[PDB]
Design a protein around this nucleic acid. Sequence first.
DNA 1: CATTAGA
DNA 2: TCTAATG
Length: 327
Amino acid sequence: ETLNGGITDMLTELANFEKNVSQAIHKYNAYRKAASVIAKYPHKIKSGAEAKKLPGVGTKIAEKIDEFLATGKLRKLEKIRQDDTSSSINFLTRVSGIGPSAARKFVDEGIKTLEDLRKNEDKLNHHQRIGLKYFGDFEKRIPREEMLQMQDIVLNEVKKVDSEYIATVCGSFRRGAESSGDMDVLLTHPSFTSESTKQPKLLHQVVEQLQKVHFITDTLSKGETKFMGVCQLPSKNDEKEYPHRRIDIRLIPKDQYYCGVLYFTGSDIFNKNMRAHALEKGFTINEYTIRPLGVTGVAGEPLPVDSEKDIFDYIQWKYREPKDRSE
DNA sequence: CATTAGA
DNA sequence: TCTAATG
Ligand code: NA
Ligand code: NA
């Protein structure tokens, strides 16, 4: 957790490099398994050799470790930290819509900057257009103050359109959290579940609503069960307009909401820990259901849920207010 | 680990 | 269709 601090960090920088700049899924995949294990290691690594005895630690990394342990740095790490090319890809990538592949391509055309981007806005697709457009706001955190307002909006429509809707703003927001990255709306409706052959309109219907009123301002992607867009709060009595905010609405078959919802609300740790428990308690949890574990090895059969409670019960835990779904 | 775009 | 990107 700290005794292995730098080692793990160098390792991740490294891993990251292969992954992004180079197309080195393997090397990259190496660095991380390595960073995973040294992290677990209970002791202060004193040398490559020592490290080396570990699984995943080949000679390649050991070597790296000594140098860093030796001198407060690593050259390669230094060389890469310097390089404009690689530097360039690390940057472009921030653009929502821009991945590594695209990053490299742009770079090799000479697109390195933001401006560069604008000059060749033509070479960009919609998503990437909007990513570039809202570059600034997309980087900014959402205050809970704002969150509440937004939420309030979405909840109001959803209902106005159909009363039978059920929306849940998941995430950290849902976990109390003072700020949030974007907003997630868990959507479900009774007339939609596991089997009931869809109702795409069920999604569409509301998307449309949000837009009609101008909450939704852009679409990154709209498909039958997953919308990806941009939204924004009505800039009051002027002098202050709102930043454009990332947003994701998604249709869920009523018979899987609470799992979905439990799940999405995290925290990543709570899940696992919650997940790990259902296992002893003879279960199996995942993004959509909970199933009784059968001796033979495995076993199925989707236990029925009407609240985040039911699920708890099943595994006989204490209902944890999301506030405390912290870990 | 899945759903959407894209070309 | 593959492949890329976000979640
Ligand atoms: Na080894
Ligand atoms: Na990006």
